[PDB]
Amino acid sequence: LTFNVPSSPPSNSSAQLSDAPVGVSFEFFAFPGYWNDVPSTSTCLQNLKDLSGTWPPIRIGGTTQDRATYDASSSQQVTYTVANAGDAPSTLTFGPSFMSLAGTYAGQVTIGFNRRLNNLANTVAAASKAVNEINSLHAIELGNEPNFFSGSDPIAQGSSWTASADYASEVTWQDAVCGNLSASNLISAGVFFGTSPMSIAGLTAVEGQANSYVRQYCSHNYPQSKSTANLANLMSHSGIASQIKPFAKEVAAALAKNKPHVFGETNSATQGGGGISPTYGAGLWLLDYVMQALIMGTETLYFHHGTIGNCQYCWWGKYSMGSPYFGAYFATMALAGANKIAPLDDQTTGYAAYAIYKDDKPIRVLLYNSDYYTSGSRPSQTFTLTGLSGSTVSAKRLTAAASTSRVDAGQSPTVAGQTFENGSCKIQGQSTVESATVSGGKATFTLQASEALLVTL
Ligand SMILES: C[C@@H]1O[C@@H](O[C@H]2[C@H](O)[C@@H](O)[C@@H](O)O[C@@H]2C(=O)O)[C@H](O)[C@H](O)[C@H]1O
Ligand SMILES: C[C@@H]1O[C@@H](O[C@H]2[C@H](O)[C@@H](O)[C@H](O)O[C@@H]2C(=O)O)[C@H](O)[C@H](O)[C@H]1O
Ligand SMILES: *[C@@H]1O[C@H](CO)[C@@H](O)[C@H](O)[C@H]1NC(C)=O
Ligand SMILES: *[C@@H]1O[C@H](CO)[C@@H](O)[C@H](O)[C@H]1NC(C)=O
Ligand SMILES: *[C@H]1O[C@H](CO)[C@@H](O)[C@H](O)[C@@H]1O
């Protein structure tokens, strides 16, 4: 395997990147718990800001945003009952202090409010409070995954809930919210799970002048369920290229409206994740997915964090770190301060190489070996880079014992030999940097199955 590193961005490069493409989504009812009850939240976010110079953007939403009513006279951030701490509530209220708490975050904040219950005046009042309380407010969603609403939901108003019904609903709600707030460029529109039966392509065709009310168009993506869980398939480099392809039309539809696309809620697998979601391989999926989604043209990805103590795809909890945090950390490291990324491979194999540009000059190369590995002799692949300078380059390696390695089982992955403390997210260990010879502008690297390597030029 040999890849030429071009001296300026290739034609199949990404567009200019955001300052911090890797963000975090927090299930709406659990957001105060993440801030108040989970010590690792602050440090895990600070660790990423320390790499990029920008707070990861955050989003607060999910199914529970459509179970929630704003209570302007509540002094509580969030009020609900569950039978077990592991359950999500069937209903909840949130006070104005919920938005104030989100307003303590310095990074860009997206907040999702309720459209399913058709409480339009209540959602307008929550939106007004969000604008007042959240200085770094990026966007407001009006409903989460309206593709899953039914004729039984208040928003359907006793008629069938079709794609056309939702698009018409979104324009009406965008008009009422922006009209009441005298605002524009505010709504995170669509918020669809996948691309059928509702699509950004379909919504943008109907938006017309209400496009002016839209900040961004939003997709959700979860490649697998508990029932289709297959870690080798999830993390496969060529598999990821196939998996994201339906969203290419969604990105194109948003960008034709001069509005960004985001994956405003995404993670490995649904119902909070399956046996594959806490693995090292799910962190490698996350790493490679981020790179491919940004080249496709999405602006930002927000990885979902669900019920505290019952969340398989979470990067951290109250007590343990999760292997997937290593993918988010490495992706953030790879992209830090970069303007563009370009795929050097053709995405037909398990092996990836990306050139990473700053000021139109190559600064880093990210290599990825997506081969699934659990037992026996671990295979490896050599990667040759051409077109380089000097007599030597440096590299940092992401590795673990197996594709299935879990931090909570004691098999943490390492990022240049470092790990993150259980219960705090503090960085731990001695960093180790590798070096390689450059002769005649070529250097060779070896990646075992299920590894990634960030080469600094
Ligand atoms: C799946 C895992 O859940 C959370 O970690 C658990 C861990 O599995 C358990 O053994 C114990 O240590 O409690 C922690 C916790 O609740 O923090 C955590 O969300 C982690 O990121 C996940 O991978
Ligand atoms: C209530 C919530 O349910 C799951 O999270 C959902 C998420 O709310 C939804 O927007 C997305 O399509 O699917 C997620 C998923 O199935 O994982 C999780 O079980 C959460 O932990 C829980 O809080
Ligand atoms: C404001 O919101 C209400 C819904 O509570 C709606 O009836 C009204 O038309 C909206 N006003 C403007 C100016 O958009
Ligand atoms: C990107 O373009 C390069 C040539 O500049 C090519 O070798 C590579 O296969 C392309 N990758 C993709 C995924 O289009
Ligand atoms: C990666 O390391 C292998 C040894 O396993 C070499 O063949 C290669 O040239 C590079 O140093």
Coordinates of C-alpha atoms and ligand atoms in Angstrom, one line a residue:
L1 CA 0.0 0.0 0.0
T2 CA 1.5 3.3 -1.1
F3 CA -0.1 6.8 -1.0
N4 CA 1.3 10.1 -2.4
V5 CA 0.8 13.0 0.0
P6 CA -0.1 16.0 -2.3
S7 CA 1.6 19.4 -1.6
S8 CA -1.8 21.2 -1.7
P9 CA -5.4 20.0 -1.1
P10 CA -6.6 17.5 -3.7
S11 CA -9.9 18.1 -5.6
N12 CA -11.7 15.4 -3.5
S13 CA -10.7 17.3 -0.3
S14 CA -13.3 18.3 2.3
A15 CA -14.5 21.9 2.3
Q16 CA -12.9 24.2 4.9
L17 CA -13.5 22.5 8.3
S18 CA -15.2 23.8 11.4
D19 CA -12.9 24.7 14.4
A20 CA -14.2 21.6 16.3
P21 CA -16.1 19.1 14.1
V22 CA -16.4 16.5 16.9
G23 CA -19.3 17.3 19.2
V24 CA -21.5 15.7 21.8
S25 CA -25.2 15.2 22.1
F26 CA -26.8 14.7 25.6
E27 CA -30.2 13.1 26.0
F28 CA -32.5 15.9 27.0
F29 CA -33.8 14.7 30.4
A30 CA -30.2 13.6 31.4
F31 CA -28.4 16.8 30.5
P32 CA -28.6 18.3 34.1
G33 CA -27.3 14.9 35.4
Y34 CA -24.4 15.1 33.0
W35 CA -23.4 18.5 34.3
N36 CA -24.3 18.1 38.0
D37 CA -23.7 14.4 38.8
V38 CA -21.0 13.1 36.4
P39 CA -17.5 14.4 37.3
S40 CA -16.0 13.2 34.0
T41 CA -18.2 15.5 31.9
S42 CA -16.2 18.7 32.5
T43 CA -12.7 17.1 32.1
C44 CA -13.6 14.9 29.1
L45 CA -14.9 18.1 27.3
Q46 CA -11.9 20.2 28.5
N47 CA -9.5 17.4 27.2
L48 CA -10.9 17.9 23.7
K49 CA -10.8 21.7 23.9
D50 CA -7.2 21.4 25.0
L51 CA -6.4 19.6 21.7
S52 CA -8.4 21.8 19.2
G53 CA -8.5 25.2 21.1
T54 CA -12.4 25.1 20.7
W55 CA -15.0 23.7 23.2
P56 CA -16.7 20.7 21.5
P57 CA -20.1 21.9 20.3
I58 CA -22.9 20.3 22.2
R59 CA -26.6 19.4 21.5
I60 CA -29.3 18.7 24.1
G61 CA -32.1 16.6 22.7
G62 CA -33.4 13.1 21.8
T63 CA -36.7 11.3 22.2
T64 CA -37.2 12.8 25.7
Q65 CA -37.2 16.4 24.2
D66 CA -40.7 15.3 22.8
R67 CA -41.8 14.0 26.3
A68 CA -40.9 17.4 27.9
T69 CA -42.9 20.6 28.7
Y70 CA -41.4 23.9 29.7
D71 CA -42.5 25.1 33.2
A72 CA -41.7 28.8 33.4
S73 CA -42.4 28.9 37.1
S74 CA -40.2 25.7 38.0
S75 CA -37.1 26.5 40.1
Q76 CA -35.9 22.9 39.1
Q77 CA -33.8 22.3 36.0
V78 CA -35.6 19.1 35.2
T79 CA -38.5 17.4 37.1
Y80 CA -39.5 13.7 36.4
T81 CA -40.1 10.3 38.1
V82 CA -38.7 6.9 37.0
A83 CA -39.1 3.5 38.7
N84 CA -35.3 2.7 38.2
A85 CA -32.3 5.2 37.6
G86 CA -31.8 3.0 34.4
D87 CA -35.2 4.1 32.8
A88 CA -35.9 7.2 30.8
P89 CA -39.0 9.1 32.0
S90 CA -42.3 8.9 30.0
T91 CA -42.9 12.6 30.8
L92 CA -40.9 15.5 32.3
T93 CA -40.9 19.3 32.8
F94 CA -37.9 21.6 32.7
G95 CA -37.5 25.1 34.3
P96 CA -35.8 28.2 32.8
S97 CA -32.7 27.1 34.8
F98 CA -32.3 24.1 32.3
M99 CA -31.5 26.7 29.6
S100 CA -29.4 28.7 32.1
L101 CA -27.3 25.6 32.8
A102 CA -26.8 25.1 29.0
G103 CA -25.8 28.8 29.0
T104 CA -22.9 28.1 31.3
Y105 CA -21.2 26.2 28.4
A106 CA -18.7 28.3 26.4
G107 CA -18.9 26.1 23.2
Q108 CA -21.8 26.3 20.7
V109 CA -25.0 24.9 22.1
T110 CA -28.0 23.4 20.2
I111 CA -31.1 22.7 22.2
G112 CA -34.1 20.6 21.2
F113 CA -37.7 21.4 22.1
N114 CA -41.0 19.5 21.8
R115 CA -43.1 19.4 18.7
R116 CA -44.7 15.9 19.1
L117 CA -47.1 17.2 21.8
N118 CA -48.3 20.2 19.6
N119 CA -47.8 22.7 22.5
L120 CA -46.7 25.5 20.1
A121 CA -47.0 28.4 22.6
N122 CA -45.0 26.4 25.2
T123 CA -42.2 25.7 22.7
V124 CA -42.1 29.4 21.6
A125 CA -41.8 30.4 25.3
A126 CA -38.9 27.8 25.8
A127 CA -37.2 29.1 22.6
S128 CA -37.4 32.7 23.9
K129 CA -35.9 31.6 27.2
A130 CA -33.1 29.7 25.4
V131 CA -32.2 32.9 23.4
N132 CA -32.2 35.0 26.7
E133 CA -30.1 32.5 28.7
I134 CA -27.6 30.8 26.2
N135 CA -25.1 33.3 24.9
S136 CA -23.4 30.6 22.7
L137 CA -26.8 29.4 21.4
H138 CA -26.2 27.9 17.9
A139 CA -29.6 26.5 17.0
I140 CA -33.0 25.3 18.3
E141 CA -34.7 22.0 17.1
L142 CA -38.5 21.8 16.9
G143 CA -39.0 18.1 17.4
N144 CA -36.7 15.2 17.4
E145 CA -36.9 12.4 14.7
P146 CA -40.4 13.5 13.5
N147 CA -40.2 10.5 11.1
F148 CA -41.1 8.4 14.1
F149 CA -44.2 10.5 15.1
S150 CA -47.6 8.7 14.3
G151 CA -51.2 9.6 13.6
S152 CA -51.7 9.0 17.4
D153 CA -49.5 12.0 18.4
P154 CA -51.0 15.4 19.1
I155 CA -48.9 17.0 16.2
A156 CA -50.6 14.8 13.6
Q157 CA -54.0 16.6 14.5
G158 CA -56.1 13.4 13.8
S159 CA -54.7 13.0 10.2
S160 CA -52.0 10.6 8.9
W161 CA -48.4 11.7 9.7
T162 CA -46.7 11.7 6.3
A163 CA -43.4 13.4 5.1
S164 CA -45.6 16.2 3.6
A165 CA -47.4 16.6 6.9
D166 CA -44.1 17.0 8.7
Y167 CA -42.6 19.4 6.2
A168 CA -45.7 21.7 6.4
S169 CA -45.5 21.4 10.2
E170 CA -41.8 22.4 10.3
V171 CA -42.4 25.5 8.1
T172 CA -45.4 26.6 10.3
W173 CA -43.4 26.1 13.6
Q174 CA -40.2 27.8 12.1
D175 CA -42.5 30.8 11.1
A176 CA -44.2 31.0 14.6
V177 CA -40.9 30.6 16.6
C178 CA -38.8 33.0 14.5
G179 CA -41.8 35.4 14.2
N180 CA -42.3 35.5 18.0
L181 CA -38.5 35.9 18.7
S182 CA -37.9 38.4 15.7
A183 CA -35.1 36.0 14.8
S184 CA -33.8 34.2 11.7
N185 CA -31.0 31.7 11.0
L186 CA -32.0 29.8 14.2
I187 CA -33.8 26.5 13.6
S188 CA -32.0 23.1 13.3
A189 CA -34.5 21.7 10.8
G190 CA -35.5 18.1 9.9
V191 CA -33.8 16.2 12.7
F192 CA -34.7 12.9 10.8
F193 CA -33.6 9.4 11.6
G194 CA -32.0 8.3 8.4
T195 CA -33.3 9.4 5.0
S196 CA -36.7 7.7 4.6
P197 CA -39.6 8.2 5.0
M198 CA -38.6 11.9 5.7
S199 CA -35.5 13.6 4.2
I200 CA -33.6 16.9 4.2
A201 CA -34.0 16.6 0.3
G202 CA -37.8 16.5 0.7
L203 CA -38.0 19.3 3.5
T204 CA -35.6 21.7 1.6
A205 CA -37.9 21.4 -1.5
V206 CA -40.9 22.8 0.6
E207 CA -39.1 25.3 2.9
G208 CA -39.1 28.2 0.4
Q209 CA -38.7 31.5 2.2
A210 CA -38.8 29.7 5.7
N211 CA -35.2 28.6 4.7
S212 CA -34.3 32.1 6.2
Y213 CA -35.4 30.8 9.6
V214 CA -33.1 27.7 9.3
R215 CA -29.6 27.7 10.9
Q216 CA -28.7 24.1 9.6
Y217 CA -30.3 21.0 8.4
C218 CA -29.9 18.0 10.7
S219 CA -29.7 14.2 10.2
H220 CA -29.5 11.4 12.7
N221 CA -27.5 8.3 12.0
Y222 CA -27.1 5.0 13.9
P223 CA -25.6 2.4 11.6
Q224 CA -26.8 -0.6 13.6
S225 CA -29.4 -1.8 16.1
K226 CA -29.1 -4.3 19.0
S227 CA -30.4 -6.9 16.4
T228 CA -28.0 -6.0 13.5
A229 CA -24.9 -5.5 15.7
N230 CA -21.7 -6.7 14.0
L231 CA -18.6 -4.9 15.2
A232 CA -16.4 -5.9 12.1
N233 CA -19.1 -4.5 9.8
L234 CA -19.5 -1.3 11.8
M235 CA -15.8 -0.4 11.8
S236 CA -15.0 -1.6 8.3
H237 CA -13.5 1.4 6.3
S238 CA -15.3 0.4 3.1
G239 CA -18.4 -0.4 5.1
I240 CA -18.5 3.1 6.6
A241 CA -18.2 4.5 3.0
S242 CA -21.3 2.5 2.0
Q243 CA -23.2 3.3 5.2
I244 CA -23.0 7.1 4.9
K245 CA -23.7 7.2 1.2
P246 CA -27.5 7.8 1.6
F247 CA -26.7 11.1 3.4
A248 CA -24.7 12.5 0.4
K249 CA -28.1 13.7 -1.1
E250 CA -29.0 15.2 2.3
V251 CA -25.8 17.2 2.5
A252 CA -26.2 18.4 -1.1
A253 CA -29.8 19.5 -0.4
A254 CA -28.7 21.6 2.7
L255 CA -25.7 23.1 0.9
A256 CA -27.9 24.1 -2.1
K257 CA -29.8 26.3 0.5
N258 CA -26.5 27.8 1.7
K259 CA -27.1 26.1 5.1
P260 CA -24.8 23.6 6.7
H261 CA -25.6 19.9 7.3
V262 CA -24.9 18.3 10.7
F263 CA -25.3 14.8 12.1
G264 CA -27.0 16.3 15.2
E265 CA -27.3 13.0 16.9
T266 CA -25.3 9.9 16.0
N267 CA -23.8 6.8 17.6
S268 CA -22.9 3.2 16.9
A269 CA -26.2 1.5 17.6
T270 CA -29.7 2.1 18.9
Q271 CA -31.6 1.5 22.2
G272 CA -28.5 3.0 24.0
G273 CA -26.2 0.7 22.1
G274 CA -25.5 -3.1 22.0
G275 CA -22.6 -5.4 23.2
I276 CA -20.5 -3.8 20.4
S277 CA -21.0 -0.2 21.5
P278 CA -18.5 0.0 24.5
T279 CA -15.7 -1.6 22.4
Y280 CA -12.4 -0.2 21.1
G281 CA -13.7 -1.1 17.6
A282 CA -16.7 1.3 18.1
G283 CA -14.2 4.0 18.8
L284 CA -12.3 3.2 15.6
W285 CA -15.7 3.3 13.8
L286 CA -16.2 6.8 15.3
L287 CA -12.8 8.0 14.2
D288 CA -13.1 6.8 10.5
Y289 CA -16.8 7.8 10.3
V290 CA -16.0 11.4 11.4
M291 CA -13.4 11.7 8.6
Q292 CA -15.6 10.3 5.9
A293 CA -18.7 12.3 7.0
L294 CA -16.6 15.6 7.0
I295 CA -15.3 14.9 3.4
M296 CA -18.9 14.1 2.3
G297 CA -19.7 17.7 3.5
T298 CA -21.3 17.5 7.0
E299 CA -20.1 20.3 9.3
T300 CA -20.3 18.7 12.7
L301 CA -21.1 15.3 14.3
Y302 CA -22.7 15.1 17.7
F303 CA -22.3 11.7 19.4
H304 CA -25.2 10.8 21.7
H305 CA -24.9 10.2 25.4
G306 CA -28.0 8.5 26.9
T307 CA -29.3 7.6 30.4
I308 CA -26.6 7.8 33.0
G309 CA -25.7 4.3 34.2
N310 CA -27.6 2.7 31.2
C311 CA -25.7 3.8 28.1
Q312 CA -23.5 1.4 26.1
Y313 CA -22.2 4.0 23.5
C314 CA -21.3 6.7 26.1
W315 CA -17.7 7.9 26.1
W316 CA -17.8 8.1 29.9
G317 CA -20.1 7.5 32.9
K318 CA -20.1 8.4 36.6
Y319 CA -17.6 5.5 37.3
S320 CA -15.8 4.3 34.1
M321 CA -14.4 5.7 30.9
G322 CA -15.6 4.0 27.6
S323 CA -13.2 2.8 24.8
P324 CA -15.1 5.0 22.3
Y325 CA -13.8 8.1 23.9
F326 CA -10.4 7.1 22.4
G327 CA -11.8 7.5 18.9
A328 CA -13.3 10.9 19.7
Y329 CA -10.0 12.0 21.3
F330 CA -7.9 10.7 18.3
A331 CA -10.3 12.3 15.8
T332 CA -10.1 15.6 17.6
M333 CA -6.2 15.3 17.7
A334 CA -6.2 14.5 13.9
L335 CA -8.3 17.5 13.0
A336 CA -7.0 20.1 15.5
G337 CA -6.4 23.4 13.7
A338 CA -6.7 21.7 10.3
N339 CA -8.5 23.5 7.3
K340 CA -9.1 20.4 5.1
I341 CA -8.8 16.6 4.9
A342 CA -8.5 14.5 1.8
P343 CA -8.9 10.7 1.3
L344 CA -5.8 9.2 -0.2
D345 CA -7.3 5.7 -0.6
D346 CA -10.3 4.8 -2.8
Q347 CA -12.4 3.4 0.1
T348 CA -12.8 0.0 -1.4
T349 CA -10.6 -1.8 1.3
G350 CA -10.2 -2.0 5.0
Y351 CA -7.2 0.4 4.9
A352 CA -7.5 4.2 5.0
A353 CA -5.1 7.1 4.6
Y354 CA -6.1 10.8 4.9
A355 CA -4.0 13.9 4.3
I356 CA -4.7 16.7 6.6
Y357 CA -4.0 20.3 5.5
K358 CA -3.5 23.6 7.3
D359 CA -3.2 26.8 5.2
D360 CA -3.3 24.5 2.1
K361 CA -0.1 22.6 3.2
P362 CA 0.0 19.0 4.5
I363 CA 0.6 18.8 8.2
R364 CA -0.5 15.3 9.2
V365 CA -1.5 11.9 7.7
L366 CA -4.1 9.7 9.5
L367 CA -3.7 6.0 8.8
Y368 CA -6.3 3.4 9.8
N369 CA -6.3 -0.5 9.7
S370 CA -10.0 -1.5 10.2
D371 CA -9.4 -5.3 10.1
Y372 CA -11.4 -7.0 12.9
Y373 CA -9.2 -8.9 15.4
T374 CA -10.0 -10.9 18.5
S375 CA -7.7 -14.0 18.6
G376 CA -4.7 -15.7 17.2
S377 CA -1.8 -14.0 15.4
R378 CA -2.7 -10.3 14.8
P379 CA -2.3 -9.4 11.1
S380 CA -0.6 -6.1 10.0
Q381 CA -0.4 -3.9 6.9
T382 CA 2.4 -1.7 5.9
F383 CA 1.6 1.8 4.5
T384 CA 4.1 3.8 2.4
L385 CA 3.8 7.5 2.2
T386 CA 5.5 9.4 -0.8
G387 CA 6.0 13.0 -1.4
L388 CA 7.3 13.9 2.0
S389 CA 10.4 16.0 3.1
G390 CA 13.2 15.7 5.6
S391 CA 15.0 12.7 6.9
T392 CA 12.4 11.7 9.6
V393 CA 8.7 12.2 10.7
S394 CA 6.8 11.5 14.1
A395 CA 3.7 9.5 14.8
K396 CA 1.2 8.7 17.6
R397 CA -0.5 5.4 17.7
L398 CA -4.0 4.4 18.8
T399 CA -4.1 0.7 19.8
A400 CA -5.8 -1.9 22.1
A401 CA -5.4 -5.7 22.7
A402 CA -8.5 -6.5 20.4
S403 CA -11.3 -5.0 18.4
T404 CA -13.6 -6.0 21.4
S405 CA -11.4 -4.3 24.1
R406 CA -13.4 -2.6 26.8
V407 CA -12.1 -0.1 29.4
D408 CA -14.6 -1.4 31.9
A409 CA -13.3 -4.9 31.6
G410 CA -9.8 -3.6 32.2
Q411 CA -8.6 -3.7 28.5
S412 CA -8.4 0.1 27.8
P413 CA -7.1 1.3 24.5
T414 CA -4.0 3.6 24.6
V415 CA -3.4 6.9 22.7
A416 CA 0.4 7.2 22.4
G417 CA 0.5 5.0 25.6
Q418 CA -1.9 7.3 27.6
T419 CA -5.3 6.5 29.1
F420 CA -8.1 8.4 31.0
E421 CA -8.8 8.0 34.7
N422 CA -12.0 6.1 35.6
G423 CA -14.4 8.5 37.4
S424 CA -12.6 11.7 36.4
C425 CA -11.4 11.5 32.7
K426 CA -8.0 12.9 33.7
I427 CA -5.2 12.0 31.3
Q428 CA -2.9 9.3 32.7
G429 CA 0.5 7.8 31.7
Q430 CA 3.7 8.8 29.8
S431 CA 3.1 9.8 26.2
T432 CA 5.3 7.8 23.7
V433 CA 5.9 9.2 20.2
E434 CA 7.2 7.0 17.3
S435 CA 9.6 8.2 14.6
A436 CA 10.2 6.9 11.0
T437 CA 13.0 7.5 8.4
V438 CA 12.1 9.6 5.3
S439 CA 14.5 8.7 2.4
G440 CA 13.7 10.0 -1.1
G441 CA 10.5 11.5 0.3
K442 CA 9.2 8.1 1.4
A443 CA 8.4 6.7 4.8
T444 CA 6.8 3.3 5.8
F445 CA 4.5 2.6 8.7
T446 CA 3.1 -0.7 10.0
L447 CA -0.5 -0.8 11.5
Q448 CA -1.8 -4.0 13.1
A449 CA -5.4 -5.0 12.6
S450 CA -7.6 -2.5 14.5
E451 CA -5.1 0.4 14.9
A452 CA -4.8 4.0 13.8
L453 CA -1.6 6.1 13.4
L454 CA -1.4 9.9 13.2
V455 CA 1.8 11.0 11.4
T456 CA 3.0 14.6 12.0
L457 CA 4.9 16.1 9.0
Ligands
LIG1 C1 -21.0 0.4 29.2 C2 -20.3 1.5 30.0 O1 -21.2 2.0 30.9 C3 -20.6 2.9 31.8 O2 -19.5 2.4 32.5 C4 -19.9 1.6 33.7 C5 -19.2 0.3 33.7 O3 -19.7 -0.6 32.6 C6 -19.5 -0.5 35.0 O4 -18.6 -1.7 35.0 C7 -19.2 0.4 36.2 O5 -17.8 0.6 36.3 O6 -20.0 1.6 36.1 C8 -19.6 2.4 35.0 C9 -20.3 3.7 35.0 O7 -21.6 3.7 35.2 O8 -19.7 4.7 34.7 C10 -20.0 4.1 31.1 O9 -21.0 4.9 30.6 C11 -19.0 3.7 30.0 O10 -18.6 4.8 29.2 C12 -19.6 2.6 29.1 O11 -18.6 2.1 28.2
LIG2 C1 -34.6 7.8 25.9 C2 -33.3 7.4 25.4 O1 -33.5 6.4 24.4 C3 -32.3 6.0 23.7 O2 -31.7 7.1 23.0 C4 -32.3 7.3 21.7 C5 -32.5 8.8 21.3 O3 -33.3 9.4 22.3 C6 -33.1 8.9 20.0 O4 -33.2 10.3 19.6 C7 -32.3 7.9 19.0 O5 -32.9 7.7 17.8 O6 -32.2 6.6 19.5 C8 -31.4 6.6 20.7 C9 -31.1 5.2 21.0 O7 -31.9 4.2 20.7 O8 -30.0 4.8 21.5 C10 -31.2 5.5 24.7 O9 -31.7 4.3 25.2 C11 -31.0 6.5 25.8 O10 -30.1 6.0 26.8 C12 -32.4 6.9 26.5 O11 -32.1 8.0 27.4
LIG3 C1 -46.3 33.4 17.6 O1 -46.6 32.2 18.2 C2 -48.0 31.9 18.2 C3 -48.2 30.5 18.8 O2 -48.1 30.6 20.2 C4 -48.6 32.1 16.8 O3 -50.0 31.9 16.8 C5 -48.3 33.4 16.2 O4 -48.7 33.5 14.8 C6 -46.8 33.7 16.2 N1 -46.5 35.0 15.9 C7 -45.7 35.4 14.9 C8 -45.5 36.9 14.8 O5 -45.1 34.5 14.3
LIG4 C1 -9.3 11.0 -4.0 O1 -8.5 11.5 -5.1 C2 -7.2 10.8 -5.2 C3 -6.4 11.5 -6.3 O2 -6.1 12.9 -6.0 C4 -7.4 9.4 -5.5 O3 -6.2 8.6 -5.6 C5 -8.3 8.7 -4.4 O4 -8.7 7.4 -4.7 C6 -9.6 9.6 -4.2 N1 -10.3 9.1 -3.1 C7 -11.7 9.0 -3.1 C8 -12.3 8.3 -1.9 O5 -12.4 9.6 -3.9
LIG5 C1 6.4 -1.2 10.0 O1 7.0 -2.2 10.8 C2 7.2 -3.4 10.0 C3 7.6 -4.5 11.0 O2 6.5 -5.3 11.5 C4 8.1 -3.1 8.9 O3 8.0 -4.1 7.8 C5 7.8 -1.7 8.1 O4 8.8 -1.4 7.2 C6 7.5 -0.6 9.1 O5 8.7 -0.2 9.9

